[PDB]
């Protein structure tokens, strides 16, 4: 780490979001857990940001950021040439959806993940324990 390690704050996430936007990053690029990890390791190395913050809701559909101030979301988008598919994809999303990063400044004014999917925050849901667990179980999302 070139910088002392620190935790993500909403203000830092907001500043990062607009800076990445201005540099042309992320917008329209295909999401993957691999690219996701590459981003978080780089941000720990270069910005000293502990990689515990970059999480999205479970889906399916639009995946909303669980960090207030992160202004990026994952939006779903719309193969019998198997050999070419092998050459380009030889070997994943639990809902089989292809996602792209999308910038949304309104996420600074509405904490969509917490307000529409509070149960995905577990003991930080603001809901009784039996309530958020039952909601997660009905949607197939484990809570360990």
């Amino acid at each position: 780490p070139k910088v002392p390690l620190r935790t993500m704050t909403p203000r830092l996430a907001r500043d990062m979001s607009f800076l990445i936007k201005d540099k042309g990053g992320l917008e329209g690029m295909y999401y993957s857990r691999r690219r996701h990890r590459i981003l978080d390791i780089y941000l720990e190395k270069e910005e000293g940001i502990i990689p515990d913050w970059h999480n999205y809701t479970h889906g399916p559909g639009i995946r909303f950021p669980k960090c207030p101030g992160w202004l990026w979301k994952l939006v779903p988008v719309d193969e019998q040439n198997d050999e070419a598919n092998y050459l380009l994809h030889p070997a994943d999303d639990p809902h089989g959806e292809t996602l792209v990063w999308r910038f949304d400044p309104m996420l600074a004014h509405e904490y969509v993940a917490f307000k529409k999917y509070p149960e995905e925050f577990g003991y930080q849901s603001g809901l009784p324990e039996d309530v958020w667990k039952a909601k997660l179980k009905a949607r197939g999302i484990p809570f360990n």
Side-chain angles (χ1 to χ4, degrees):
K2 304 174 177 177
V3 186
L5 293 180
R6 49 168 174 184
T7 64
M8 181 65 86
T9 62
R11 175 57 199 267
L12 182 52
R14 174 182 179 90
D15 291 336
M16 288 307 306
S17 294
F18 276 108
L19 185 59
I20 299 177
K21 172 44 101 169
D22 193 54
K23 294 175 162 178
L26 299 194
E27 183 77 28
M29 314 170 144
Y30 287 99
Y31 173 86
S32 76
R33 294 282 320 181
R34 183 182 171 279
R35 284 179 163 181
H36 192 159
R37 302 191 322 270
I38 284 173
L39 292 172
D40 294 353
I41 286 131
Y42 172 89
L43 284 174
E44 183 179 28
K45 286 172 58 194
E46 300 296 322
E47 298 291 326
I49 301 178
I50 288 137
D52 65 2
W53 65 273
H54 196 182
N55 309 110
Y56 304 92
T57 49
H58 183 265
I62 294 183
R63 323 294 171 90
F64 293 96
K66 295 169 77 168
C67 166
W70 186 244
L71 311 182
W72 294 92
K73 64 189 176 195
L74 314 176
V75 177
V77 295
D78 282 311
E79 307 199 277
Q80 219 193 16
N81 188 335
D82 297 283
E83 185 153 16
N85 285 124
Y86 163 80
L87 292 175
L88 306 167
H89 189 12
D92 279 330
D93 184 59
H95 312 278
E97 291 186 309
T98 310
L99 308 157
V100 298
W101 266 290
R102 287 299 181 201
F103 186 80
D104 188 358
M106 280 297 110
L107 290 174
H109 311 136
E110 222 65 38
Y111 195 5
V112 174
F114 187 71
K115 300 225 246 181
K116 263 175 93 150
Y117 312 96
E119 69 274 12
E120 294 196 37
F121 293 80
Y123 293 105
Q124 280 62 249
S125 65
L127 302 172
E129 176 169 9
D130 288 336
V131 172
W132 67 260
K133 276 175 169 174
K135 276 150 111 59
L136 286 188
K137 196 171 182 143
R139 302 178 52 204
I141 317 174
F143 48 81
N144 302 41

